[PDB]
Amino acid sequence: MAVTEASLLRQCPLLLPQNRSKTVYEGFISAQGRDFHLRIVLPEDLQLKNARLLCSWQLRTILSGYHRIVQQRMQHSPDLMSFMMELKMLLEVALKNRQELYALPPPPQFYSSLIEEIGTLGWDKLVYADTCFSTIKLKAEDASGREHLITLKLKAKYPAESPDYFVDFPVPFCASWTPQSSLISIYSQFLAAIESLKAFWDVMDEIDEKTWVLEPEKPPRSATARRIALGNNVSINIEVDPRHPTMLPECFFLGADHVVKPLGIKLSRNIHLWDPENSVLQNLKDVLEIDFPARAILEKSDFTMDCGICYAYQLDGTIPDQVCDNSQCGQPFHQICLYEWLRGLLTSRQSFNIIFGECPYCSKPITLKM
Amino acid sequence: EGVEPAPWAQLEAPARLLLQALQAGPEGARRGLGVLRALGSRGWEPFDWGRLLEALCREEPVVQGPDGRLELKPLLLRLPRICQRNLMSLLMAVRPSLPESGLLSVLQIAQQDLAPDPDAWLRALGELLRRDLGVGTSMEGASPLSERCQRQLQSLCRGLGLGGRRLKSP
Amino acid sequence: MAQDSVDLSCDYQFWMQKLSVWDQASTLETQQDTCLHVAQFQEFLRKMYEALKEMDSNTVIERFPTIGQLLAKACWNPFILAYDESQKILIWCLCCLINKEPQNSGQSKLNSWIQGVLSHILSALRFDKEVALFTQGLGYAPIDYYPGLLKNMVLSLASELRENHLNGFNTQRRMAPERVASLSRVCVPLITLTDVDPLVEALLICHGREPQEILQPEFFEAVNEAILLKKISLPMSAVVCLWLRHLPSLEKAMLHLFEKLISSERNCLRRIECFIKDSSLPQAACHPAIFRVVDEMFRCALLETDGALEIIATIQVFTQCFVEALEKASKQLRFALKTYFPYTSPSLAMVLLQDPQDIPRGHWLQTLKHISELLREAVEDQTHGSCGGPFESWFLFIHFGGWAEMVAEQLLMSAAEPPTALLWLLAFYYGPRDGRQQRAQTMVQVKAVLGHLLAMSRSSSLSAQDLQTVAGAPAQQLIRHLLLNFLLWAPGGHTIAWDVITLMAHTAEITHEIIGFLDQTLYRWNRLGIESPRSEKLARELLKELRTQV
Ligand SMILES: [Zn+2]
Ligand SMILES: [Zn+2]
Residues from chain B contacting residue C252 (CB–CB below 8 Å): 149
**Exposure pattern of C240-251 as b/e (b: 16+ CB <10 Å)?**
bbbbbbbbbbbb
For residue A342, CA distances in Å to A95, A335, A346, C211, C463 come to 35, 10, 9, 22, 80
Whether the CB-CB separation of A62 and A50 falls below 8 Å is answered with no
Cα–Cα distance measured from residue A145 to residue C538, given in angstroms and rounded to the nearest whole number: 68
Cα–Cα distance measured from residue A112 to residue C239, given in angstroms and rounded to the nearest whole number: 63
Collect all residues with Cβ–Cβ distance below 8 Å to C294 and sequence separation of at least 6: C250, C254, C281, C285, C318
Documented resolution in Å: 3.1
CB atoms closer than 10 angstroms to residue C321: 17
Across the interface, which of B6, B128, B132 has its CB nearest the CB of C169?
Answer: B6
| Helix or strand run (H / E) with residue A366 | strand A365-369
Q: What is the CA radius of gyration of chain A?
A: 31
Q: Residue type at C312? A: I
Could you tell me the distance, in angstroms and rounded to a whole number, from the CA of residue B11 to the centre of ligand 2? Answer: 19
Cα–Cα distance measured from residue A85 to residue C16, given in angstroms and rounded to the nearest whole number: 52
Chain C: closest CA distance from residue B146 (Å)? 8
Residues from chain B contacting residue A218 (CB–CB below 8 Å): 45
Whether the CB-CB separation of B96 and A172 falls below 8 Å is answered with yes
Cα–Cα distance measured from residue C304 to residue C178, given in angstroms and rounded to the nearest whole number: 44
Cα–Cα distance measured from residue C446 to residue C430, given in angstroms and rounded to the nearest whole number: 12
Across the interface, which of C171, C338, C366 has its CB nearest the CB of A346?
Answer: C171
Q: Residue type at A15? A: L
Return the SS3 of C209: coil
Cα–Cα distance measured from residue C375 to residue C370, given in angstroms and rounded to the nearest whole number: 9
**Exposure pattern of C363-390 as b/e (b: 16+ CB <10 Å)?**
ebbebbbbbbebbbbbbeeeeeebbeeb
> What is residue C448's DSSP assignment?
H
- The distance from CA A22 to its chain's CA centroid, rounded to whole angstroms, is 50
Query: CB burial class (10 A; 0-12, 13-18, 19+) of residue C68?
Result: middle
Q: Hey, is the C-beta of A74 within 8 angstroms of any chain B C-beta?
A: no
Residue A26's φ and ψ, nearest 5 degrees, are -145, 150
**Cα-Cα-Cα-Cα dihedral sign, residues A284, A285, A290, A296:** positive
Collect all residues with Cβ–Cβ distance below 8 Å to C491 and sequence separation of at least 6: C534
Whether the CB-CB separation of C292 and B92 falls below 8 Å is answered with yes
Beta bridge partners of A37: A28
**Cα-Cα-Cα-Cα dihedral sign, residues C302, C304, C309, C310:** negative
Whether the CB-CB separation of B109 and B57 falls below 8 Å is answered with yes
Short-list C255, C260, C267, C258, CA closest to C508: C267
Residues from chain B contacting residue C237 (CB–CB below 8 Å): 25-26
Whether the CB-CB separation of C224 and C218 falls below 8 Å is answered with no
Cα–Cα distance measured from residue C352 to residue C398, given in angstroms and rounded to the nearest whole number: 10
Whether the CB-CB separation of C214 and C181 falls below 8 Å is answered with yes
A251 annotated as ligand-binding:
no
Inter-chain touch C347–A247, beta carbons under 8 Å = yes
Query: CB burial class (10 A; 0-12, 13-18, 19+) of residue A266?
Result: middle
Chain C: closest CA distance from residue A305 (Å)? 12
Q: Residue type at C37? A: H
For residue C324, CA distances in Å to A270, B61, C327, C329, C473 come to 22, 47, 5, 9, 40
Cα–Cα distance measured from residue C182 to residue C27, given in angstroms and rounded to the nearest whole number: 10
Cα–Cα distance measured from residue A76 to residue B132, given in angstroms and rounded to the nearest whole number: 45
Q: Quick one: closest CA in B to C473, which residue?
A: B164
Residues from chain A contacting residue C332 (CB–CB below 8 Å): 254, 306, 311-312
Cα–Cα distance measured from residue C529 to residue C532, given in angstroms and rounded to the nearest whole number: 10
Please report, to the nearest 10 degrees, the dihedral formed by the alpha carbons of residues C205, C206, C210, C214 taken in order: -80
Cα–Cα distance measured from residue A316 to residue A313, given in angstroms and rounded to the nearest whole number: 9
CB atoms closer than 10 angstroms to residue C396: 20
What does B95-130 look like in DSSP terms, one character per residue? Answer: GGGS-HHHHHHHHHHHHT-S-SS--HHHHHHHHHHH
Cα–Cα distance measured from residue C211 to residue C420, given in angstroms and rounded to the nearest whole number: 58
Cα–Cα distance measured from residue B41 to residue A215, given in angstroms and rounded to the nearest whole number: 7
Collect all residues with Cβ–Cβ distance below 8 Å to C358 and sequence separation of at least 6: A264, A265, A268, A269
Across the interface, which of C237, C296, C430 has its CB nearest the CB of B165?
Answer: C430
Whether the CB-CB separation of B46 and A220 falls below 8 Å is answered with yes
Q: What is the CA radius of gyration of chain C?
A: 32
Tell which phi-psi region holds residue A218, choosing left (phi > 0), alpha (psi between -120 and 50) or beta: left
Return the SS3 of B93: helix
- The distance from CA C429 to its chain's CA centroid, rounded to whole angstroms, is 27
Cα–Cα distance measured from residue C339 to residue C346, given in angstroms and rounded to the nearest whole number: 10
Return the SS3 of A17: strand
Residues, chain A: 370
Residues, chain B: 170
Cα–Cα distance measured from residue C130 to residue C117, given in angstroms and rounded to the nearest whole number: 24
Cα–Cα distance measured from residue C167 to residue A349, given in angstroms and rounded to the nearest whole number: 12
**Cα-Cα-Cα-Cα dihedral sign, residues C198, C204, C209, C210:** positive
Q: Hey, is the C-beta of A239 within 8 angstroms of any chain C C-beta?
A: yes
Collect all residues with Cβ–Cβ distance below 8 Å to C142 and sequence separation of at least 6: C123, C125, C135
Return the SS3 of B80: coil
Q: Quick one: closest CA in C to B65, which residue?
A: C212
The side-by-side arrangement of strands in the sheet containing A250-254 is A228-230, A234-239, A250-254
- The distance from CA C123 to its chain's CA centroid, rounded to whole angstroms, is 41
**Solved how?**
cryo-EM
Inter-chain touch A249–C333, beta carbons under 8 Å = no
- The distance from CA C186 to its chain's CA centroid, rounded to whole angstroms, is 26
Q: Residue type at A256? A: A
